[PDB]
Amino acid sequence: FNVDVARPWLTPKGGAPFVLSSLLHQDPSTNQTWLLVTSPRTKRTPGPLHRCSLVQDEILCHPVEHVPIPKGRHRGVTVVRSHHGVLICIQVLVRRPHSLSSELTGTCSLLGPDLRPQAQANFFDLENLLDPDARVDTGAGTEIAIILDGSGSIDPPDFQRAKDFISNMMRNFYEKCFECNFALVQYGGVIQTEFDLRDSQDVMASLARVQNITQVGSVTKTASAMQHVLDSIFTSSHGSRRKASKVMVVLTDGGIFEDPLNLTTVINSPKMQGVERFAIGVGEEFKSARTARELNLIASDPDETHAFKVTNYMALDGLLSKLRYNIISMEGTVGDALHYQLAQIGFSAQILDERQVLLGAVGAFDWSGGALLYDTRSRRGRFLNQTAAAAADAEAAQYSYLGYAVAVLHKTCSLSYIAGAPRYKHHGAVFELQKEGREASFLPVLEGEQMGSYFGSELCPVDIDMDGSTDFLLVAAPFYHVHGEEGRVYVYRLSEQDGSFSLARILSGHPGFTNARFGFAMAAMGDLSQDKLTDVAIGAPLEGFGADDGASFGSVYIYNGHWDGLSASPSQRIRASTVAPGLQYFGMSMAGGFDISGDGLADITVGTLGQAVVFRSRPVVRLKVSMAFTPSALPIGFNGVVNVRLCFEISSVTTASESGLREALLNFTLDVDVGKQRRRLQCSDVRSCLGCLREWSSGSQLCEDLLLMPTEGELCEEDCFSNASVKVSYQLQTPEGQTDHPQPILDRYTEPFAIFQLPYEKACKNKL
Amino acid sequence: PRGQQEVLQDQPLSQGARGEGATQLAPQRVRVTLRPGEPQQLQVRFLRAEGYPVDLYYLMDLSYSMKDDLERVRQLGHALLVRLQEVTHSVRIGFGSFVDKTVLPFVSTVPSKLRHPCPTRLERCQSPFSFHHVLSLTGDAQAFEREVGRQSVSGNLDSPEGGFDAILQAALCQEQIGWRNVSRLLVFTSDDTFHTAGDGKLGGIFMPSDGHCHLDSNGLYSRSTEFDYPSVGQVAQALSAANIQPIFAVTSAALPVYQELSKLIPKSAVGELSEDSSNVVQLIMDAYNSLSSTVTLEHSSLPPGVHISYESQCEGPEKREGKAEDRGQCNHVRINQTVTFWVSLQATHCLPEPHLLRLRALGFSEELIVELHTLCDCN
Amino acid sequence: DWVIPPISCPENEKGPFPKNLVQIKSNKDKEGKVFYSITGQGADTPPVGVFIIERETGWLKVTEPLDRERIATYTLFSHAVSSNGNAVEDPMEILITVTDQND
Ligand SMILES: *[C@@H]1O[C@H](CO)[C@@H](O[C@@H]2O[C@H](CO)[C@@H](O[C@@H]3O[C@H](CO)[C@@H](O)[C@H](O)[C@@H]3O)[C@H](O)[C@H]2NC(C)=O)[C@H](O)[C@H]1NC(C)=O
Ligand SMILES: *[C@@H]1O[C@H](CO)[C@@H](O[C@@H]2O[C@H](CO)[C@@H](O[C@@H]3O[C@H](CO)[C@@H](O)[C@H](O)[C@@H]3O)[C@H](O)[C@H]2NC(C)=O)[C@H](O)[C@H]1NC(C)=O
Ligand SMILES: *[C@@H]1O[C@H](CO)[C@@H](O[C@@H]2O[C@H](CO)[C@@H](O)[C@H](O)[C@H]2NC(C)=O)[C@H](O)[C@H]1NC(C)=O
Ligand SMILES: *[C@@H]1O[C@H](CO)[C@@H](O)[C@H](O)[C@H]1NC(C)=O
Ligand SMILES: *[C@@H]1O[C@H](CO)[C@@H](O)[C@H](O)[C@H]1NC(C)=O
Ligand SMILES: *[C@@H]1O[C@H](CO)[C@@H](O)[C@H](O)[C@H]1NC(C)=O
Ligand SMILES: [Ca+2]
Ligand SMILES: [Ca+2]
Ligand SMILES: [Ca+2]
Ligand SMILES: [Mn+2]
Ligand SMILES: [Mn+2]
Ligand SMILES: [Mn+2]
Ligand SMILES: [Mn+2]
């Protein structure tokens, strides 16, 4: 129909950007149109948003400046548009100290109508941002190195006590510290590693080799033991991590004897920077001050709580007090409840006004969902969720994913927000914000019919006549199953009197494809038919998967709006194979309704997976057709000339229609005396009247004079006194040549034929 | 001259499991003396005394919520294998596993928990994975018991578990799972709802799943993080295309979720993995007992001038109305059921006096032998 | 650490010399070779070498006869070093009394 699949503009194949979604944006105050595209992060892509405009019949792209910068893996980029501005959200990862699980919330930047930056938002510590009275308007780890003195001068009982201390500390640290890893060394005489950091990955094996270690007597080399621990255990060559905090536990009798390295040569060395030290006195030979001084020099600077005796198993708290961890309750374990840690605010979004935005929160409260109504100016918002106070069992509402999609409804009285919950009771539901007293909560209004269909994953209100109300609401069930996943899209008429929903139609793709995923992407494309109603577009990304050579697959359907609602059958079906090769998943994102091509008509955009296509639209010419005869009424027994005049003209005009009207062709035939066994009127040039093919020059008019006359041979004798009827049938043929302009098209909903009458003069008192 | 028909050997039917103890067809030898325009007839009977072969993939969830239920699955495997091996001589049983995708919202990504997902470091555990094929379909029962008795639990972040990916990959990975193309059964164990297509969006996975095999050499579905979970439609289509009947042995709490899935996947069955676990074994025996066959009578090439035809009769007086070659087949035979046939032979002219031919059931080891004597001359 | 009983050497004994009074025993000797060097007034400062110690055993020996009534007591110390040159035991202030003969 309108869409000009002849000349599609494509972003360069393979190279950047990698388009995940495309949307056109027009600045109201400047009438500039850009084709915005979001892309994931790579070593080549400069950012998550680009603006691309058509120059030299090529789509050229640049990065938007003040958008937030993604980092690390791809985790979601949302871009939504309204005549007030653009809102771009990026899912980001943050880890807090001593937390064993990470948070995942959004970072959003609101640019104005001209893509300059206006507002910023970081949804960490959401409990601060919340104001539950806000009116809703509607109009590294640690590593411990144990250096154990088996030098002799330590009777076996003391060795066993030290061994027990090691085992007890190890067990407690494994029980109550998760990111703790251990090492062990024994330096009586030679230095002898008993197990390494790499062994500590197995708690049972490391704990088991403790109680099996044997003594080595000889001589007390503390300095060499510590230097070896620094040089061969706290090093990456033996599994030591760069950022992990490092700790030591010297378990010695403080009797240093025959050691080459001054113990100050080691404690003041470069490598001991940043390494904690705990001393412990094994046995009892602290009769003199030398042992105490050595033991404390081993101990870190704050000698309090850094020197002990093996008998005090409570010695190494502080480490166990500071290294305590917390877990988000996960899949069978006890822990902190999920409130806002993984809310994913910004998953969906809708700009309501210059100040306020509405953000989906699919993950809040065990993935029940919600939506944060965020006032960017004051930086405060309200959380809107399903009410759990009616019945104490909120478990029935977990994993609903309310907020997977969000929309608004512009009823004649007030706005009314709706939110899709594509896993409600495993069917899916569409919620509507209802307000009563001092409370405002979501309640279930529509429900799906099949498990796993994802009913409510996409919503598209449509104002069919552009009057401020919302007449229909389209709800998507992209994974509906009959044979495969064909998809399905419901069409809910919206009542003006009551504001409730009533079903009108169920839409399904062209038969023969089992995996279309019809309903994945819906976008009200504004006015493409140039007739002041709202047309819709529905995508089917997987239509054609694996067919033939697999060059391209996908489809997009166009549903022209009508006075009584959305049309019954699509007016067009763009197929991937007819646009260009290499298009895969053509139809996953769609937008349009603005002039990006350079002429007054609206244009569409359909993003594939990895490319964006832009389609111009064609003028619609509806032809006025009129005629006259000579003589006006057939005389009695007329054998004379029947001269005709057949004048054509245009009935609706635009600049584009003027630009393109004049390189297509008109083709019209004349059928004379319709419906009779035999005709009364010839065509003096049979080749001509039965078929003509003319070219159209200027202005709006193109007329022709053609000749008829009485049928050859004997004249009719059975129907002389009745009227004749002449039917003109016109078709418009468009060459494929390289005409710069989009060539016109006749209206699909208007008859291509027009019928006139040629009377006859009866013999009665009144001829006609 | 006149024709004659005769039987040359005797053999009764039997009910053994193995070929020597089993009987498939009528006695082995007969004789027929044909003459021009004088057809003669023979009678045949068939019995399926042996059982069909079977293939059985046991696919169990190894998330942490299953720690209390692992005794049940470990016993279910044994109680299933004993029953099946008491009936069919040639069972094959495999084993696979699954936890979830390795992306943040589903599985924690911090390295410490990625190595040791369990709450405490004293627990015996294993790193998360999406699908880990552990034992290709084999006749070694002891291997299956030893392997199923060795796996350890993993962790996860969300109650939904991604077993749909495992089912799809089991369906699509035929060459390395080890399917024999005979009869297939999948026994899927879990105690949680399942992820479906659309859930991957939360983890940033945009690429729709595709119907191709993605098992590494070690058996892991490594590329899982890059594709979305399959839709129930895709799973149904794949299982149907591969003729696999699923049997969801699911906990009494996750049973209501899977009893609606049973309606979409047509041939499936759902049971409760109780402490007794006889109901699931009975379901699997009912699935095995659904197997039926259509028996056809093959025959050897006839000598010049000779012809042949068939007739069949099912249980009861029922015949087959399709004449000629159609009556050479009988359908809907199950365990220890029997059917019968009549084969007619005719001669137009003689060329060799002696001859021989052979017939049998379609693809069966036992066969029949016919000795022909076609004559033109007078007595 | 050290193991030393109270110390005394009577007045003006009969020879010959040296004579053993007490033993200056260290503690880390179980790991080996704790050598000695007595010092202080009386050993390495006048009166010269009145008391000297054997370097390995630790025997404190009197070198020549004594009298209190010239000096009442002789304070002393002991360095104690290992074979690697590092000190082991810090000095302990021995204090010997020539116990009077009531004359
Ligand atoms: C950007 O494009 C829009 C849409 O075409 C333009 O809006 C149009 O603005 C004109 C005035 O500039 C509006 O009035 C027109 O004026 C005269 C009578 O005064 C007459 O030629 C027309 O009948 C018309 O009334 C016009 O209604 C308005 N169109 C719409 C649909 O609202 C806008 O001006 C453009 N902006 C710039 C900066 O050029
Ligand atoms: C809808 O959202 C409301 C909040 O706007 C949810 O109610 C809240 O539910 C949480 C569940 O954890 C309650 O948290 C409480 O916090 C502490 C710390 O654990 C403790 O007192 C309790 O054990 C409990 O966990 C919270 O009090 C409660 N109310 C408020 C005002 O926050 C509600 O659950 C959501 N409904 C659904 C269906 O998701
Ligand atoms: C003008 O349009 C008419 C249809 O409105 C064309 O008529 C067709 O002519 C072909 C032969 O050329 C016939 O086989 C078809 O049955 C006719 N009708 C249709 C609907 O195709 C006519 O050909 C056109 N003229 C030119 C010059 O192309
Ligand atoms: C550990 O026990 C083994 C025997 O099981 C023994 O050979 C070894 O010496 C013991 N000691 C250590 C430190 O492993
Ligand atoms: C099963 O049959 C298919 C289709 O004929 C064949 O390609 C395949 O090799 C066979 N075996 C297996 C294990 O799939
Ligand atoms: C060690 O260094 C100190 C000064 O830090 C020095 O006095 C001492 O002699 C050195 N040697 C020993 C054995 O302590
Ligand atoms: Ca309206
Ligand atoms: Ca329209
Ligand atoms: Ca245009
Ligand atoms: Mn020692
Ligand atoms: Mn459980
Ligand atoms: Mn689980
Ligand atoms: Mn999970």
mmCIF file of C-alpha atoms in Angstrom, chain A residues 18 20 40 73-76 93 95 100-104 171 174-175 177-181 200-204 207 241 325 327-333 342 344 347 362 367 399 401 404 423 425-427 449-452 454 479 481 483-485 514-515 517 542 545 585 588 609, chain B residues 61 63-66 99 103-106 108-110 112-113 115-122 154-161 191-199 201-211 225 229-234 236-237 256-258 260-261 264-265:
data_model
loop_
_atom_site.group_PDB
_atom_site.id
_atom_site.type_symbol
_atom_site.label_atom_id
_atom_site.label_comp_id
_atom_site.label_asym_id
_atom_site.label_seq_id
_atom_site.Cartn_x
_atom_site.Cartn_y
_atom_site.Cartn_z
ATOM 1 C CA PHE A 18 24.657 -3.043 16.387
ATOM 2 C CA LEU A 20 18.853 -3.481 19.146
ATOM 3 C CA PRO A 40 25.243 -2.809 23.191
ATOM 4 C CA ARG A 73 28.504 -6.869 30.080
ATOM 5 C CA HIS A 74 25.313 -5.787 28.372
ATOM 6 C CA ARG A 75 22.382 -5.695 30.773
ATOM 7 C CA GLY A 76 19.655 -3.584 29.135
ATOM 8 C CA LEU A 93 25.892 -3.439 38.541
ATOM 9 C CA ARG A 95 28.582 -4.396 44.842
ATOM 10 C CA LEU A 100 28.149 -11.637 48.965
ATOM 11 C CA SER A 101 25.516 -10.715 46.355
ATOM 12 C CA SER A 102 25.218 -7.711 44.078
ATOM 13 C CA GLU A 103 22.546 -5.112 43.359
ATOM 14 C CA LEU A 104 21.103 -4.451 39.899
ATOM 15 C CA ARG A 171 36.763 -24.208 61.259
ATOM 16 C CA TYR A 174 35.240 -21.342 57.163
ATOM 17 C CA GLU A 175 31.877 -21.419 58.945
ATOM 18 C CA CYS A 177 33.631 -16.118 56.722
ATOM 19 C CA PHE A 178 32.993 -17.091 53.116
ATOM 20 C CA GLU A 179 35.655 -15.214 51.152
ATOM 21 C CA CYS A 180 38.410 -16.367 53.530
ATOM 22 C CA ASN A 181 41.254 -18.532 52.216
ATOM 23 C CA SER A 200 42.351 -24.065 50.660
ATOM 24 C CA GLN A 201 39.739 -24.253 47.892
ATOM 25 C CA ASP A 202 38.748 -27.559 49.552
ATOM 26 C CA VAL A 203 37.764 -26.944 53.167
ATOM 27 C CA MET A 204 37.752 -30.605 54.185
ATOM 28 C CA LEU A 207 41.270 -29.076 57.631
ATOM 29 C CA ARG A 241 45.061 -12.504 44.639
ATOM 30 C CA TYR A 325 28.962 -11.398 55.515
ATOM 31 C CA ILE A 327 23.493 -13.144 51.827
ATOM 32 C CA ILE A 328 20.360 -12.277 49.897
ATOM 33 C CA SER A 329 17.974 -15.162 50.581
ATOM 34 C CA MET A 330 18.378 -17.465 47.598
ATOM 35 C CA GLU A 331 16.498 -20.550 46.527
ATOM 36 C CA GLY A 332 16.356 -22.563 49.743
ATOM 37 C CA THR A 333 18.523 -20.662 52.214
ATOM 38 C CA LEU A 342 17.376 -6.431 42.344
ATOM 39 C CA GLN A 344 15.716 -3.277 37.930
ATOM 40 C CA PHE A 347 13.141 -1.888 32.812
ATOM 41 C CA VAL A 362 10.008 -5.974 37.451
ATOM 42 C CA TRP A 367 9.978 -10.293 41.447
ATOM 43 C CA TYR A 399 7.319 -13.919 40.004
ATOM 44 C CA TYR A 401 6.845 -9.551 36.623
ATOM 45 C CA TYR A 404 7.472 -5.744 32.223
ATOM 46 C CA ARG A 423 3.537 -14.259 34.299
ATOM 47 C CA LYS A 425 -0.916 -17.142 37.287
ATOM 48 C CA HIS A 426 1.298 -18.328 34.422
ATOM 49 C CA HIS A 427 -1.107 -16.735 31.927
ATOM 50 C CA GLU A 449 -5.961 -17.779 28.296
ATOM 51 C CA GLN A 450 -2.860 -19.968 27.836
ATOM 52 C CA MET A 451 0.143 -20.874 29.949
ATOM 53 C CA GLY A 452 3.433 -19.450 28.749
ATOM 54 C CA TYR A 454 3.337 -13.912 27.908
ATOM 55 C CA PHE A 479 4.340 -16.814 22.352
ATOM 56 C CA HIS A 481 0.899 -21.829 20.832
ATOM 57 C CA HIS A 483 1.614 -25.448 16.323
ATOM 58 C CA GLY A 484 4.836 -23.776 17.414
ATOM 59 C CA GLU A 485 4.546 -20.188 18.669
ATOM 60 C CA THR A 514 4.273 -21.808 12.669
ATOM 61 C CA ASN A 515 6.993 -19.715 14.346
ATOM 62 C CA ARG A 517 5.974 -14.681 16.985
ATOM 63 C CA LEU A 542 10.638 -15.175 13.166
ATOM 64 C CA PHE A 545 13.115 -18.887 9.981
ATOM 65 C CA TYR A 585 14.652 -10.932 12.785
ATOM 66 C CA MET A 588 11.593 -6.750 16.442
ATOM 67 C CA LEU A 609 18.635 -7.479 14.857
ATOM 68 C CA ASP B 61 17.420 -30.722 38.797
ATOM 69 C CA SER B 63 19.592 -26.686 42.510
ATOM 70 C CA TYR B 64 19.803 -26.219 46.254
ATOM 71 C CA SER B 65 16.060 -26.512 46.864
ATOM 72 C CA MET B 66 16.463 -30.170 45.838
ATOM 73 C CA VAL B 99 20.610 -25.754 37.318
ATOM 74 C CA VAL B 103 23.745 -14.435 34.513
ATOM 75 C CA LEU B 104 23.089 -12.101 37.401
ATOM 76 C CA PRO B 105 19.326 -12.121 38.087
ATOM 77 C CA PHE B 106 19.232 -15.946 37.894
ATOM 78 C CA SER B 108 25.000 -14.910 41.342
ATOM 79 C CA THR B 109 28.118 -13.790 39.481
ATOM 80 C CA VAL B 110 30.560 -12.889 42.276
ATOM 81 C CA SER B 112 33.273 -16.754 45.393
ATOM 82 C CA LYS B 113 29.658 -17.874 45.044
ATOM 83 C CA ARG B 115 32.774 -21.472 42.768
ATOM 84 C CA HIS B 116 30.861 -22.514 45.918
ATOM 85 C CA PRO B 117 27.147 -21.697 45.574
ATOM 86 C CA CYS B 118 26.079 -23.274 48.880
ATOM 87 C CA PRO B 119 25.525 -21.212 52.043
ATOM 88 C CA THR B 120 28.571 -22.611 53.883
ATOM 89 C CA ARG B 121 32.008 -23.667 52.679
ATOM 90 C CA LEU B 122 31.836 -26.994 54.521
ATOM 91 C CA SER B 154 24.645 -26.520 43.190
ATOM 92 C CA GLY B 155 23.143 -23.120 43.957
ATOM 93 C CA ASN B 156 21.003 -20.476 42.336
ATOM 94 C CA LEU B 157 19.321 -17.164 43.074
ATOM 95 C CA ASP B 158 15.682 -17.531 41.963
ATOM 96 C CA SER B 159 13.108 -20.265 42.527
ATOM 97 C CA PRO B 160 12.382 -20.765 38.807
ATOM 98 C CA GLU B 161 14.810 -23.272 37.330
ATOM 99 C CA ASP B 191 10.493 -28.862 42.389
ATOM 100 C CA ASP B 192 10.116 -25.343 40.978
ATOM 101 C CA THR B 193 8.429 -23.395 38.216
ATOM 102 C CA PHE B 194 10.298 -23.021 34.931
ATOM 103 C CA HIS B 195 11.642 -20.049 33.034
ATOM 104 C CA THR B 196 10.142 -19.434 29.609
ATOM 105 C CA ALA B 197 10.968 -17.233 26.652
ATOM 106 C CA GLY B 198 10.928 -13.619 27.746
ATOM 107 C CA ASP B 199 12.650 -14.180 31.067
ATOM 108 C CA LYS B 201 15.287 -10.111 28.873
ATOM 109 C CA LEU B 202 15.936 -9.562 32.581
ATOM 110 C CA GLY B 203 19.490 -10.835 32.147
ATOM 111 C CA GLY B 204 20.143 -8.868 28.973
ATOM 112 C CA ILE B 205 19.855 -11.887 26.669
ATOM 113 C CA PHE B 206 18.220 -10.629 23.479
ATOM 114 C CA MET B 207 19.076 -13.357 20.972
ATOM 115 C CA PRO B 208 16.076 -15.673 20.594
ATOM 116 C CA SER B 209 16.895 -19.331 21.044
ATOM 117 C CA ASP B 210 17.619 -21.312 17.897
ATOM 118 C CA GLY B 211 17.041 -24.971 17.174
ATOM 119 C CA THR B 225 24.278 -17.168 28.559
ATOM 120 C CA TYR B 229 15.067 -19.760 27.194
ATOM 121 C CA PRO B 230 12.807 -21.611 24.755
ATOM 122 C CA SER B 231 9.074 -21.102 24.565
ATOM 123 C CA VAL B 232 6.690 -23.916 25.431
ATOM 124 C CA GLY B 233 5.766 -23.993 21.751
ATOM 125 C CA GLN B 234 9.350 -24.677 20.703
ATOM 126 C CA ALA B 236 6.517 -29.072 22.247
ATOM 127 C CA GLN B 237 7.548 -28.906 18.595
ATOM 128 C CA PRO B 256 -0.024 -27.712 39.876
ATOM 129 C CA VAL B 257 2.313 -25.733 37.610
ATOM 130 C CA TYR B 258 3.277 -28.841 35.635
ATOM 131 C CA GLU B 260 -1.073 -27.377 32.958
ATOM 132 C CA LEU B 261 2.106 -28.049 30.980
ATOM 133 C CA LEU B 264 0.148 -28.473 25.987
ATOM 134 C CA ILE B 265 2.742 -31.207 25.419
#
